[PDB]
């Protein structure tokens, strides 16, 4: 599939799991479903910052349906980036350790 082009709206609060991971549920605002969801994690200065995806591959099957995503963010201060372009969702997260 091609990367999603649309905008994202946050549907729920970000949550920390029992084992230091986060569950994010978002609502899609695009027209190109089905498409692959742009997902990346950075820091404050825009620097790409390592981490790993627990979810296989985040895809918008139906633009009217919210998608859940579990991820293991880097330690300390980071930004969760959902989507791409000017309207890209940027959410602050801290993981102690």
């Amino acid at each position: 599939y091609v990367m999603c082009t649309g905008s994202f709206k946050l549907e729920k609060e970000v949550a920390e799991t029992q084992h230091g991971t986060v569950l994010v549920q978002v609502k899609y605002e695009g027209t190109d479903a089905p498409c692959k969801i742009p997902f990346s994690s950075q820091d404050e200065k825009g620097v790409t910052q390592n981490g790993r995806l627990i979810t296989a591959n985040p895809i918008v099957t139906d633009k009217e349906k919210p998608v859940n995503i579990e991820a293991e963010p880097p330690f300390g201060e980071s930004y969760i980036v959902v989507g791409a372009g000017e309207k890209a969702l940027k959410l602050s997260w801290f993981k102690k350790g």
Partner: antibody, heavy 118, light 112 residues
Framework: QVQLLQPGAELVKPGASMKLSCKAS????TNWWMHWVRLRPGRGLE????????????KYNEKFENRASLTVDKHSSTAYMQLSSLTSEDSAIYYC???????????WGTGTTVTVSS | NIVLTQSPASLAVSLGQRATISCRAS??????????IYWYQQKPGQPPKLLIY???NLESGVPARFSGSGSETDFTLTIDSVETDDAATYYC?????????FGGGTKLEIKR
């Protein structure tokens, strides 16, 4: 229509400093990061740094960190890059580029041919 | 710093024939399942122009004859049928870690 305008040429002395401008139009200047990249003859493209015009947060290439300064003027939607202690090795074509966050550069400036000479 | 090495330095391809250029990284440029690598095209007197993003995704406006593939440290750009206006210098770039780095550049000629 998105435009990133740069002056066509600069002539600067070795060891001196220069300040290059990039005038953005057609979009919200503070909504996108601005990067700077130079092209040297037979030496390819080199990344200098980036800045977020909204918050003035920035990041430099460590090679240039002691030598470069990224600034903006929101009022005129213009980003500036200053580089001092210039040598002949800094003769290049300098481009500003808009960051398609958080991936590639979507819009490139007109380019500024910089000559460091006396 | 992630170092990007392109191969070959230059090549000439007969008009209408297929061209292939490789870019290799000194370490992984993958970030959350996506390759943070991009392919740009630059012509003389002109600023660069994006062709490929995230290793394999075609930018809107780019002809379908252009394609990209690869992962981790090994990547390739392919033009299945070169044209006259395809003559340019091609560069790969990474942003998986600061500072951003560019490949050495591959120069494509059109073998009339």
């Amino acid at each position: 229509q998105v435009q990133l305008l740069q002056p066509g040429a600069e002539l600067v002395k070795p060891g001196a400093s220069m300040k290059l401008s990039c005038k953005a139009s057609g979009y919200t200047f503070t909504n996108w990061w601005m990067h700077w990249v130079r092209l040297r003859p037979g030496r390819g493209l080199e990344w200098i740094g980036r800045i977020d015009p909204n918050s003035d947060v920035n990041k430099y290439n460590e090679k240039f960190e002691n030598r470069a300064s990224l600034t903006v003027d929101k009022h005129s939607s213009t980003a500036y890059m200053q580089l001092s202690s210039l040598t002949s090795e800094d003769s290049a074509i300098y481009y500003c580029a808009r960051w398609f966050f958080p991936w590639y550069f979507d819009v490139w400036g007109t380019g500024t041919t910089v000559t460091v000479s006396s | 710093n992630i170092v990007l090495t392109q191969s070959p330095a230059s090549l000439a391809v007969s008009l209408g024939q297929r061209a292939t250029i490789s870019c290799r990284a000194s370490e992984s440029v993958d970030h959350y399942g996506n390759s943070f690598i991009y392919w740009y095209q630059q012509k003389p007197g002109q600023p660069p122009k994006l062709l490929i993003y995230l290793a394999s995704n075609l930018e809107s406006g780019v002809p379908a004859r252009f394609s990209g593939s690869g992962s981790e440290t090994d990547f390739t750009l392919t033009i299945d049928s070169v044209e006259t206006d395809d003559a340019a210098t091609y560069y790969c770039q990474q942003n998986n870690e600061d500072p951003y780095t560019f490949g050495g550049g591959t120069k494509l000629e059109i073998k009339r």
